[PDB]
Paper text:
Affilin proteins, artificial binding proteins based on the ubiquitin scaffold, have been generated by directed protein evolution to yield de-novo variants that bind the extra-domain B (EDB) of oncofetal fibronectin, an established marker of tumor neovasculature. The structure of ubiquitin (Ub), a 76 amino acid signalling protein conserved among all eukaryotes, features a single five-stranded β-sheet enclosing a short α-helix. The crystal structures of two EDB-specific Affilin variants reveal a striking structural plasticity of the ubiquitin scaffold, characterised by β-strand slippage, leading to different negative register shifts of the β5 strands. This process recruits amino acid residues from β5 towards the N-terminus to an adjacent loop region and subsequent residues into β5, respectively, remodeling the binding interface and leading to target specificity and affinity.
Af1 and Af2 were independently evolved against the same target 67B89. Attempts to crystallise the purified Af1:7B8 complex resulted in crystals of Af1 alone that diffracted to 2.2 Å, allowing elucidation of the Af1 structure in the unbound state. The superposition of Af1 with the Af2:7B8 complex shows that the two Ub domains have different orientations. The Ub-C of Af1 is rotated approximately 180° in relation to Ub-N, around an axis almost parallel to the three-amino acid linker. Af1 Ub-N und Ub-C display almost identical overall structures (Cα RMSD 0.2 Å). The very similar structures of the Ub-N domains of Af1 and Af2 (Cα RMSD 1.5 Å) both display a −2 register shift in β5. However, there are differences in the conformations of the α2β5 loops.
Residue numbers in the entry: 1 to 153
The structure:
């Protein structure tokens, strides 16, 4: 019902949860209260790193006791990753640089998924990205993770 999450700053966050909430949902509640992006969060319990797709009830937690988790910040670094959403619900992770062309992005999607660049439309903030341009030609806030949507023609 009520659980506690320790942070490196010595602060302790109280959250309201239920056994059927996913770990991802726990990370989302931490984002609501503290503004920390879930992709940065590592939740630790009894030396185990909790998995996003699982529920608290998937873990063997004794409900008599109050549950205390430890939050560690992983990195949003060691390269520049971006994310491309597909119609089949999958999400492709790619490694890119600002000076990569949109066409090069489509080429990387071809290497990973086998989809010809001819057929790819890349969408960002309601804009179709142009093949001859670079990511840096667009005004992308690099402090945020970049998410594109892929549609076929
Ligand atoms: Cu504690
Ligand atoms: Cu490159
Ligand atoms: Cu290729
Ligand atoms: Cu997204």
């Amino acid at each position: 019902m009520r659980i506690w999450v320790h942070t490196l700053t010595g602060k302790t966050i109280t959250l309201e949860v239920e056994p059927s909430d996913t770990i991802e949902n726990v990370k989302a509640k931490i984002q609501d209260k503290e503004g920390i992006p879930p992709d940065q969060q590592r939740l630790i319990w009894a030396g185990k790193q909790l998995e996003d797709g699982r529920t608290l009830s998937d873990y063997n937690i004794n409900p008599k006791l109050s549950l205390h988790l430890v939050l560690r910040l992983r990195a949003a670094g060691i390269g520049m990753q971006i994310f491309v959403h597909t119609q089949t619900g999958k999400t492709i992770t790619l490694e890119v640089e600002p000076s990569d062309t949109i066409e090069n992005v489509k080429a990387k999607i071809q290497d990973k998924e086998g989809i010809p660049p001819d057929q790819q439309r890349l969408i960002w903030a309601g804009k179709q990205l142009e093949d001859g341009r670079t990511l840096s030609d667009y005004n992308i806030g690099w402090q945020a993770p970049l998410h594109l949507v892929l549609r076929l023609r």
